[PDB]
Ligand binder design. Structure first.
Ligand SMILES: [Zn+2]
Ligand SMILES: [Zn+2]
Ligand SMILES: [Zn+2]
Ligand SMILES: [Zn+2]
Lengths: 93, 93, 93, 93
């Protein structure tokens, strides 16, 4: 199941998400919430296999029928794509 | 070695390339010329592995230290990227 | 939404899946079922972006937390990888 | 241009490579030798774009007709593939 940090729980309380004891996770906009770290590890993994830019990954994810709300998705995605060495090497050309 | 079609040979003579009997290929600007068909099969293979845009593949090839002159490169490259189903599916976003 | 063929419905009835008239799709193992053709074009898209082998795509999908049941996934997946030209070119070496 | 370390020069002499003072680089099997570190950063870049296994990258490079001889290619290549996070994540499933 999901593991929420103090910072996650903090972000979630700010969003106004609610913890669901029955289903063993937090819920927001009607979806189970993906923790910040889980989201990072997932998006980082997906970028390594495709090296799609920020705009392409974002737009694809919104069409994905994802059952999850990804905490700090955009911020995490922007950080992943802008610090990718291989992509930096590509546009260096 | 390379296999040149009548149309390749046509393009090459117009370019002023020369056949090198010792090396079994045509030479131009100090570089062996890659036939139109070999160029297509190579660039298409490389795109399938990366799905880099026209601009990205072009800029990279210019930095590649490739020992070969690629016959009809841009034309072949633009066609490959503009007819890619996967890239079209990506940009559908 | 999903379009189910005669062949989908026969496979689904054979599985013992059940149709949800209210929610306008078939359900199996607690999941809405993705038709055979929709599954193919999706899995085909994912291979073009990664060119992962049969075994690797299978294992990854089983870990995917997919909200959909993919009809004839394994059979379709094998068809995709074994007819992929780019991968055929890769192992040709 | 190329920078050769003492370790490169040592490895090269063992290979029976030859230094060309006039063109100020080493030559081996009729090809200019790319230093160990340049070879690493190039091969690492290519793996990030493809994540091909050791055996496939190797077989492909042998068919590539690269204009450079890559110092310690196989050893460097195996190191690249066995320390890749994305590939490690893939078989983890
Ligand atoms: Zn990248
Ligand atoms: Zn493409
Ligand atoms: Zn493939
Ligand atoms: Zn890898």
């Amino acid at each position: 199941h999901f593991h929420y940090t103090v910072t996650d729980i903090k972000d979630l309380t700010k969003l106004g998400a609610i913890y669901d004891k029955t289903k063993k996770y937090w819920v927001y906009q009607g979806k189970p919430v993906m923790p910040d770290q889980f989201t990072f590890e997932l998006l980082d993994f997906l970028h390594q296999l495709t090296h799609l830019s920020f705009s392409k990954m974002k737009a694809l994810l919104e069409r994905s029928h994802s059952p999850y709300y990804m905490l700090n998705r955009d911020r995490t995605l922007k950080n992943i794509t802008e610090t990718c060495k291989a992509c930096a090497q590509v546009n260096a050309s």
